[PDB]
């Protein structure tokens, strides 16, 4: 087994594809730029999910959970 990783990535992005918060989206974009791993088009911006690093994926999970002080 090993698809586990990819499984999460898919489930994560899937859940986000349902979100409606644009602000949170902006923050994520920065996360992708931080890992300096992505592909920006001269007329568009796209990035692979299976290309990001553990750090990014981790930050994304925390973003959705946004569970800080309670």
């Amino acid at each position: 087994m090993d698809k586990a990783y990819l499984d999460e990535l898919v489930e994560l992005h899937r859940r986000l594809m349902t979100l409606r918060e644009r602000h949170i989206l902006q923050q994520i974009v920065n996360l992708i730029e931080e890992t300096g791993h992505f592909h920006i088009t001269n007329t568009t911006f796209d990035f692979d999910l299976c290309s990001l690093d553990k750090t990014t994926v981790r930050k994304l999970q925390s973003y959705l959970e946004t569970s800080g002080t309670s």
Partner: peptide
Amino acid sequence: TQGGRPSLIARIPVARILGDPEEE
């Protein structure tokens, strides 16, 4: 023979995040 290994990629037009495609 007939496996599966699709690439999960997401496209987000900068015109959405940046909000500056070709002005007006």
